[PDB]
Amino acid sequence: SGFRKMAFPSGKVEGCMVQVTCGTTTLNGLWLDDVVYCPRHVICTSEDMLNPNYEDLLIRKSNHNFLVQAGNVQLRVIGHSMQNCVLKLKVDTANPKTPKYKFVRIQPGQTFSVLACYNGSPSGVYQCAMRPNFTIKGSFLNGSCGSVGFNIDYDCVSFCYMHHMELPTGVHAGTDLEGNFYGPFVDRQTAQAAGTDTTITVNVLAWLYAAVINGDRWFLNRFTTTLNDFNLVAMKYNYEPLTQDHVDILGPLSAQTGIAVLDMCASLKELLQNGMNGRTILGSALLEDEFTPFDVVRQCSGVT
Amino acid sequence: SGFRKMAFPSGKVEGCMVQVTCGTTTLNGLWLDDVVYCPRHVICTSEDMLNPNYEDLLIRKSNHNFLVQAGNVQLRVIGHSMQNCVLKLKVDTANPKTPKYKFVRIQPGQTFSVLACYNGSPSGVYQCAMRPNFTIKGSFLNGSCGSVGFNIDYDCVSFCYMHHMELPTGVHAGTDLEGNFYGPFVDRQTAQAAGTDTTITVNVLAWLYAAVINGDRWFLNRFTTTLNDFNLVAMKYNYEPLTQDHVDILGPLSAQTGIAVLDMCASLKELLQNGMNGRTILGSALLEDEFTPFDVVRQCSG
Ligand SMILES: *[C@@H](CC(=O)OCC)[C@H](C[C@@H]1CCNC1=O)NC(=O)[C@H](Cc1ccccc1)NC(=O)[C@H](N)Cc1ccccc1
Ligand SMILES: *[C@@H](CC(=O)OCC)[C@H](C[C@@H]1CCNC1=O)NC(=O)[C@H](Cc1ccccc1)NC(=O)[C@H](N)Cc1ccccc1
């Protein structure tokens, strides 16, 4: 038993991390086969960032102006192109550690692992959720751009996030690996704000099932409610509306525990209206919303 | 900015994980050079659990009683011995992915990453702390024994933990890689109870510094205290006493924030006496004690 904030094993991604330097700017890239993917703002300087002319900046560059190092060992760039907000550097060496992979766009409320990297060197791995306002509450410092988020589906690494920037509120924004931002953000330094964040209801329910599976049942009573009546309470506490599709994906956790989804909804309603009364749930005194139903199943069933 | 429960990258350890089968019992092993390490209770069955006579069980086995697989390649066993509660299986092929490593025995309050594994295949990684009562609050299912805990010191993997068992309280116990249990526990299915758990004070203070670095600052008060007076408060709330070495270890965070450790102690005193009054710190409504001062520096300096 037990429940931790668990990330995917990072080995397959570690072997893809490189550093990309353009003049005085260095950030991280993702080296897959004979291409390195990185944020295009690596070609910028301070004079550029309000309205970078990325096409102008790139055409002034030769393959020789890009310095790519894999473990501080240089790779030769033989081509360069731009796809949306990502630079694609073609190198003369294919990465022999490239895993089976896919580029995927994740949905708000879904989770992924982030391999935080600096100067092409992995520093740590943690779990993040894509917030309903299309930011992530990550942990990133100067030099972290180009760090990626990923899930492992079977034996395939599904890359879903490349890091670009931190908003003044301390939250983070980035792109998919095709270079399209999540949310209403741009890679120019205009004043940018994320929408109001909401709590991911289906994940809170998943985590309450995780608590039941682990024997932490004090919040459970033989109560139940309707989906409409639950959602009336949810919106009073800035929780996302729970749809029948959310109910369905909680099926496996309901099946394991024998607690109907709307019974757990009734328990959650009671927690929101009356509080937790100084009690903890799986070691937390707040309601946690960055575990998906699949996250709980994986950790409560040990998939490899 | 930001602050997360962050583990070490697990790649160097992933390449060391194998599956060990004895009879119909399968768990995980650690393959370094030409030795596979795993919990010795792999050689047990239902009968032996009360008081396994491990020496009898092991001497009666042959090399052929052990099936070791790295992925789907079989590693032929050429010897089998016991070191404390760990089985050492000598195999014919040395692990080509053996990292620079050390076996280290860590102290209570220190943190490490756990690569949770099943049938020799990694499932996930998370961060744990050695509790003062020498248990860990991990996440382990049946088949997870032999999973290891580690820290990374640049290029060197320091293995500190191998998973053996779960106490009925939901917490976990295991050994170092020399086979010696942390705490008073034994690998027998006997009524075993963990001593009273306490809160790791130096880690709470490190996390409060992480909060200040991240802009959470409402809990700061202008008072300073002394180490003796603070420790009287620690004792009341089942916090570990704070030593001068702890204070000095917090020095890098005090230097980054300009807040003296004993000033942060006075802020923690008020938090412990009166709670947080509906406010949060780094997204938590509890005082978090599984980040060491180093974990905060490493994450807040990169
Ligand atoms: C990554 C940049 C990098 O690694 O290369 C230089 C060494 C860095 C990551 C943030 C720095 C601190 N922690 C972070 O996550 N990104 C930036 O510094 C970013 C550059 C940028 C990206 C897109 C558009 C304009 C500038 N600048 C920022 O994050 C600043 N907070 C400014 C900012 C930019 C856009 C929206 C809001 C604020
Ligand atoms: C690991 C064993 C394994 O991999 O199986 C081989 C086929 C497993 C991990 C616990 C199971 C569920 N989650 C866990 O962390 N360990 C056991 O099952 C363990 C076996 C054992 C080890 C030493 C001494 C006796 C039995 N049994 C237990 O953990 C039970 N909770 C019984 C128990 C043992 C010791 C103290 C308190 C309870």
Side-chain angles (χ1 to χ4, degrees), chain A residues 1 139-140 166 290 299, chain B residues 1 4 11 123 139-140 166 299:
Chain A
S1 68
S139 180
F140 290 118
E166 184 176 292
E290 284 194 8
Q299 187 172 166
Chain B
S1 302
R4 277 304 200 210
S123 164
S139 173
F140 294 112
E166 176 172 301
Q299 184 173 163

Side-chain angles (χ1 to χ4, degrees), chain B residues 25-26 41 49 140-143 145 163-164 166 187-189:
Chain B
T25 304
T26 298
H41 64 255
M49 260 310 104
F140 294 112
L141 307 160
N142 280 92
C145 291
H163 182 56
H164 287 244
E166 176 172 301
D187 49 356
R188 319 177 29 231
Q189 204 162 321

Side-chain angles (χ1 to χ4, degrees), chain A residues 69 72 77 99 106 133 138 185 249 264 284 289 299:
Chain A
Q69 303 174 255
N72 319 323
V77 173
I106 56 164
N133 68 1
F185 305 113
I249 60 172
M264 200 63 77
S284 181
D289 81 338
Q299 187 172 166

Side-chain angles (χ1 to χ4, degrees), chain A residues 199-221 223-234 237-249:
Chain A
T199 299
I200 306 157
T201 308
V202 66
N203 289 1
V204 178
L205 293 163
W207 173 77
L208 294 172
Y209 277 107
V212 173
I213 293 169
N214 280 270
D216 199 359
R217 276 177 91 111
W218 65 262
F219 57 84
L220 280 177
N221 304 101
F223 304 170
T224 194
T225 188
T226 66
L227 191 56
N228 169 245
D229 281 8
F230 171 80
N231 280 330
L232 292 203
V233 179
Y237 292 97
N238 210 25
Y239 270 57
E240 94 196 339
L242 194 78
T243 64
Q244 186 62 44
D245 291 335
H246 292 152
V247 174
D248 298 338
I249 60 172

Side-chain angles (χ1 to χ4, degrees), chain A residues 1-4 6-12 14 115-116 118 122-129 137-141 166 170 172 280 283-286 288 290 298-302 304, chain B residues 1-4 6-12 14 115-119 121-128 137-141 166 170 172 280 283-286 288 290 298-302:
Chain A
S1 68
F3 206 72
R4 305 305 290 142
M6 188 172 286
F8 289 96
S10 55
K12 288 167 172 113
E14 294 169 45
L115 184 67
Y118 295 92
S123 161
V125 66
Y126 54 84
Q127 207 65 352
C128 269
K137 301 201 273 206
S139 180
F140 290 118
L141 309 168
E166 184 176 292
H172 303 102
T280 57
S284 181
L286 285 177
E288 298 293 333
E290 284 194 8
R298 206 145 37 60
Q299 187 172 166
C300 293
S301 298
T304 47
Chain B
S1 302
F3 196 75
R4 277 304 200 210
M6 187 180 303
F8 285 102
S10 56
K12 297 186 167 6
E14 289 170 50
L115 183 68
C117 283
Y118 298 89
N119 294 109
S121 291
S123 164
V125 64
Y126 53 87
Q127 197 69 358
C128 281
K137 301 192 177 147
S139 173
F140 294 112
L141 307 160
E166 176 172 301
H172 301 105
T280 54
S284 186
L286 294 182
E288 294 286 335
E290 298 215 344
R298 170 183 146 252
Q299 184 173 163
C300 293
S301 304

Side-chain angles (χ1 to χ4, degrees), chain A residues 25-27 41 49 54 140-145 163-168 172 181 186-190 192, chain B residues 1:
Chain A
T25 287
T26 296
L27 50 75
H41 69 237
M49 278 331 256
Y54 282 108
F140 290 118
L141 309 168
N142 281 326
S144 66
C145 288
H163 185 53
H164 288 245
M165 61 208 193
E166 184 176 292
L167 299 183
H172 303 102
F181 266 93
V186 292
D187 57 355
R188 53 188 289 251
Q189 189 162 347
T190 54
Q192 296 179 62
Chain B
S1 302

Side-chain angles (χ1 to χ4, degrees), chain B residues 50 52-71 73-75 77-99 101-153 156-189:
Chain B
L50 196 182
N53 290 50
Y54 285 108
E55 307 220 311
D56 179 77
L57 295 182
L58 186 54
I59 292 157
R60 305 272 208 181
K61 303 262 181 183
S62 66
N63 285 344
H64 287 158
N65 281 122
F66 293 105
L67 170 59
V68 182
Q69 305 173 279
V73 47
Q74 206 204 141
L75 316 180
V77 175
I78 68 173
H80 58 271
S81 66
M82 194 162 56
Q83 184 185 1
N84 302 307
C85 302
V86 166
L87 176 66
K88 290 183 315 203
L89 305 171
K90 182 76 49 163
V91 291
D92 64 314
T93 165
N95 188 350
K97 295 181 190 153
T98 302
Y101 75 93
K102 285 184 179 122
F103 294 166
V104 310
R105 182 166 182 89
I106 62 164
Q107 289 270 62
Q110 300 195 246
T111 56
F112 56 96
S113 305
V114 167
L115 183 68
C117 283
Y118 298 89
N119 294 109
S121 291
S123 164
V125 64
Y126 53 87
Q127 197 69 358
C128 281
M130 189 48 80
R131 307 299 312 172
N133 68 3
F134 286 108
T135 69
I136 72 172
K137 301 192 177 147
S139 173
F140 294 112
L141 307 160
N142 280 92
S144 64
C145 291
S147 297
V148 296
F150 65 97
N151 286 276
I152 311 267
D153 314 285
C156 190
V157 183
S158 297
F159 296 105
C160 56
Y161 181 84
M162 181 165 270
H163 182 56
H164 287 244
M165 51 203 224
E166 176 172 301
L167 308 175
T169 56
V171 297
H172 301 105
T175 65
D176 64 15
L177 268 294
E178 274 173 5
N180 300 301
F181 265 92
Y182 288 100
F185 310 106
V186 291
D187 49 356
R188 319 177 29 231
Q189 204 162 321

